[PDB]
Amino acid sequence: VLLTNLSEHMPNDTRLQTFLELAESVLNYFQPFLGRIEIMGSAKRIERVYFEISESSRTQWEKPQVKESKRQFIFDVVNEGGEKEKMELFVNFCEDTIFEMQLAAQISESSILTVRSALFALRYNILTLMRMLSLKSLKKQMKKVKKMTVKDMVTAFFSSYWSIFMTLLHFVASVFRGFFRIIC
Amino acid sequence: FWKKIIAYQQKLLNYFARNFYNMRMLALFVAFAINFILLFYKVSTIAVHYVLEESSGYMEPTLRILAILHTVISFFCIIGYYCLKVPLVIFKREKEVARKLEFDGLYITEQPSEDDIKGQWDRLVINTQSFPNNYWDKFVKRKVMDKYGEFYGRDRISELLGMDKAALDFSDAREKKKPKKDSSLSAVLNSIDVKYQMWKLGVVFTDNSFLYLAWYMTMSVLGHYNNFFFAAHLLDIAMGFKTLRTILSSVTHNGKQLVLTVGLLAVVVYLYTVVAFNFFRKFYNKSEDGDTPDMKCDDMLTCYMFHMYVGVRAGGGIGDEIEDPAGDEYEIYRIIFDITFFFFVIVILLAIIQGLIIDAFG
Amino acid sequence: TMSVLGHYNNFFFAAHLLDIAMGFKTLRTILSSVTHNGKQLVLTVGLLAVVVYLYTVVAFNFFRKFYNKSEDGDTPDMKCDDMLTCYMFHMYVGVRAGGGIGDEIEDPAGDEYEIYRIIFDITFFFFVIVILLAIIQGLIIDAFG
Amino acid sequence: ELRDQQEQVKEDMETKCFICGIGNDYFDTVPHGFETHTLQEHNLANYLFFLMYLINKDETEHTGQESYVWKMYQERCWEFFPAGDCFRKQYEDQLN
Amino acid sequence: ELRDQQEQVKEDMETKCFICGIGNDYFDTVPHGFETHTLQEHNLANYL
Numbered sequence A: 001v002l003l004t005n006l007s008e009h010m011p012n013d014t015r016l017q018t019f020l021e022l023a024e025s026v027l028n029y030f031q032p033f034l035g036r037i038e039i040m041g042s043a044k045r046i047e048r049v050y051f052e053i054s055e056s057s058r059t060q061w062e063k064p065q066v067k068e069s070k071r072q073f074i075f076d077v078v079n080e081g082g083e084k085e086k087m088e089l090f091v092n093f094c095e096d097t098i099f100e101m102q103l104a105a106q107i108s109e110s111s112i113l114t115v116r117s118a119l120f121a122l123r124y125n126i127l128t129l130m131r132m133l134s135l136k137s138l139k140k141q142m143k144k145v146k147k148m149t150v151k152d153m154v155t156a157f158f159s160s161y162w163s164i165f166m167t168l169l170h171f172v173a174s175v176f177r178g179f180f181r182i183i184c
Numbered sequence B: 001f002w003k004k005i006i007a008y009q010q011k012l013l014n015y016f017a018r019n020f021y022n023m024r025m026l027a028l029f030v031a032f033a034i035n036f037i038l039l040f041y042k043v044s045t046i047a048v049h050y051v052l053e054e055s056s057g058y059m060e061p062t063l064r065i066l067a068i069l070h071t072v073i074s075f076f077c078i079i080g081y082y083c084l085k086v087p088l089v090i091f092k093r094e095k096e097v098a099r100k101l102e103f104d105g106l107y108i109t110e111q112p113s114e115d116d117i118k119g120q121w122d123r124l125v126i127n128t129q130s131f132p133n134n135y136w137d138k139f140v141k142r143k144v145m146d147k148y149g150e151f152y153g154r155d156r157i158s159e160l161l162g163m164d165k166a167a168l169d170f171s172d173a174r175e176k177k178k179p180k181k182d183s184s185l186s187a188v189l190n191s192i193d194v195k196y197q198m199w200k201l202g203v204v205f206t207d208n209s210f211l212y213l214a215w216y217m218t219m220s221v222l223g224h225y226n227n228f229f230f231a232a233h234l235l236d237i238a239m240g241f242k243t244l245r246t247i248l249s250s251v252t253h254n255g256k257q258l259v260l261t262v263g264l265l266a267v268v269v270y271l272y273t274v275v276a277f278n279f280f281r282k283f284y285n286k287s288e289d290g291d292t293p294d295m296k297c298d299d300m301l302t303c304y305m306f307h308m309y310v311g312v313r314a315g316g317g318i319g320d321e322i323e324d325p326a327g328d329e330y331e332i333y334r335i336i337f338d339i340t341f342f343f344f345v346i347v348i349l350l351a352i353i354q355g356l357i358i359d360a361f362g
Numbered sequence C: 001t002m003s004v005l006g007h008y009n010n011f012f013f014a015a016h017l018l019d020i021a022m023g024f025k026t027l028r029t030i031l032s033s034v035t036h037n038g039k040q041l042v043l044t045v046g047l048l049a050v051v052v053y054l055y056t057v058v059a060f061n062f063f064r065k066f067y068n069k070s071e072d073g074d075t076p077d078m079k080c081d082d083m084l085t086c087y088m089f090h091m092y093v094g095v096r097a098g099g100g101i102g103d104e105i106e107d108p109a110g111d112e113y114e115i116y117r118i119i120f121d122i123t124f125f126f127f128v129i130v131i132l133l134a135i136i137q138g139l140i141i142d143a144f145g
Numbered sequence D: 001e002l003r004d005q006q007e008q009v010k011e012d013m014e015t016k017c018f019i020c021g022i023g024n025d026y027f028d029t030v031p032h033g034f035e036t037h038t039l040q041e042h043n044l045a046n047y048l049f050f051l052m053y054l055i056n057k058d059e060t061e062h063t064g065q066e067s068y069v070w071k072m073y074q075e076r077c078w079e080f081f082p083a084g085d086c087f088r089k090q091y092e093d094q095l096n
Numbered sequence E: 001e002l003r004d005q006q007e008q009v010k011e012d013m014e015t016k017c018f019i020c021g022i023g024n025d026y027f028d029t030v031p032h033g034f035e036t037h038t039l040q041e042h043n044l045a046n047y048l
């Protein structure tokens, strides 16, 4: 807190900057627990205030129901509220939230299968496609197409994508079978 | 030898990639022509048959040729998509996984969430020698080694990313290696990354647009077996026209709200069926003759189906289709029943649907 | 030309009442609601035609027995024995019906396809009658806004 | 009306600070200035945490600022909340 | 249209002074400055 106050009130001091890199680890550790606010101080002057925020406090504030309460409060003050009582409403909401947080802290005492099936089917079908594609039959294909034979090259070109489409159909059928098995 | 084959194959790939969109438009036009012809079937009756009204006589061969052409165009559309848009998907996936590896250590620190198909499948590609094939940054493995090698283990990172430990050092010390003939066999088998191709096939199979085009091809193929399967290709107008997409965005903008409104309608009609089944069973006789009574509310499921099917579609509610309440001791209760049904199910919930559509437009 | 034709047949003078659209600023403002989204309205009509065509395909392939529109049993008037006839029947009758085609086709009770036909009628009512007409209304109201 | 109210709530939050009310245009002179101000300087969550800290802290252990804010909260005087002014606006010339 | 007109009336009253027309942003430099100006300095009731 001392170092953060000094850094924020001495923004152009390299001598303090060096201390900041030296204390980078401690400051990084304490960043979640350090809370900063600004107030209109006793000297008719705006002042920074640094305080401690508890881990339990942070968790209870980040609880989803507290977030829903915050959203409802913001909606209420923005739509059905004025600037005269805005801070009064904010303080009342803060008090209610603090009480709920404290009560929750007191009372707090202490899919994958279908993904696996789809992955296994992908593996099996693509492995079958790779097995049928990569073979010693290239010599037989050459023996068919000795010469140029644009017709043969185009036929093989279309056959490759037909095989890809058939593999996709087999994979889709396997996925459907797996889904039926898991639901039954 | 293979230079000319590769040149011709690349020429065909580029042609299909260039003409991908034009072939989609041609497929839509051929589907429209096929359906215009299909408007000319009649039933002839033993098994019945579907016969064209061959006023000119050329409709049957034209339909057969159009079906063949549509199937060929669908196959060419699949090929063109693979040539054109698959590389973009591969580039996006490679970029995403490389950035997750380098800036988050996905497979170094936190591991996939065990329910993310994308991460579980992308675990395969990291080991491949062609990991950033479409992504420009070829130094991603080196960057990950530099960032995470100091603590997590150099050898372990090398195993994770599939790169050799001291191959470069050994080659610099002494290479003593010789090349191999290209025309000789296995020169293609040893030059293809089977694991990378496996990952690519997996991601393109999981791609949504590729699946849609495969469904299009399958329906086109089924159209030869039964010609009416070509009618399913008219659904492509939704995905083909920007203005039609803008119009359908009104429906699809609040689809969740529409579905929940339908569910609420089902629940309130179920409550009305409970009330009718417990108090108004005598009024649900839907038989003209008095000899045989057709009671539509003697069973709870039958009454619920009757309400859903008839009262919702009726202009004035269930009261339009159930017996007149005049002269009964429950006349006032039944009038309230019918009026509230008309006000809630017919007037309000349908108004909720209309308002959802109009609010989506706005 | 229409005024000249009005002497030959006096009812051609009725075509001159269309000039109120081009004559009144307030009427032009009112018709601007229709004409602002005319392309969207035409495309919505086309989409309605396409979806009704799909429904006619389904009915012609599975629900031909229910399209008898004859009171007497001696002479059957089948409205879906021909694809074009079924399409015209759907467009002309089911769209104009309050509850869809199910208001005008045979009762599905007691049939083995009862559930499928109930789904058919309910989906027709929801899409053609409830949604697409709502799309037209929303287009007009959005043009006003 | 509900949709417009939600949009208005979003806009009056994305364009103004909830505490001081200074618009985002003033804070956006520094890059990310508005979000930095709303998440580090005038965070309503931080104000709630400060109120809770004051309530749970013993009265005798309060510092000068803590005692001042605590007395003002006890009297329900909310003048200590920065209204129309902030640290940056107070020390504009010193910082930049 | 009626709802939008009511909202516009509310906004042009919550953001400007009815008499001088100076926006609330100028007066809000002082805390509660706009309401103080509209209820003590340029009150239309006071003018009446």
Ligand SMILES: Nc1ncnc2c1ncn2[C@@H]1O[C@H](COP(=O)(O)OP(=O)(O)OP(=O)(O)O)[C@@H](O)[C@H]1O
Residues within 6 Å of the ligand: A067, A074, D013, D014, D016, D017, D018, D019, D034, D035, D038, D039, D042, D043, D044, D045
């Ligand atoms: N005093 C303030 N405190 C916090 N945020 C503020 C404040 N004033 C204005 N804002 C603005 O509020 C925006 C987000 O606020 P808020 O936390 O309510 O939104 P959210 O995305 O719904 O939050 P959450 O992550 O809790 O769901 C910020 O981007 C910020 O610009």
Ligand SMILES: Nc1ncnc2c1ncn2[C@@H]1O[C@H](COP(=O)(O)OP(=O)(O)OP(=O)(O)O)[C@@H](O)[C@H]1O
Residues within 6 Å of the ligand: E013, E014, E016, E017, E018, E019, E034, E035, E038, E039, E042, E043, E044, E045
């Ligand atoms: N010249 C002005 N006189 C009074 N109020 C003004 C003037 N100019 C702007 N205003 C604004 O008008 C707002 C309220 O005005 P007005 O008295 O009409 O509202 P109201 O809440 O309907 O009043 P009432 O209490 O009489 O029902 C004030 O908050 C103020 O900011």
Ligand SMILES: [Zn+2]
Residues within 6 Å of the ligand: D017, D018, D019, D020, D021, D022, D037, D042, D086
């Ligand atoms: Zn602020």
Ligand SMILES: [Zn+2]
Residues within 6 Å of the ligand: E017, E018, E019, E020, E021, E022, E037, E042
């Ligand atoms: Zn004034």
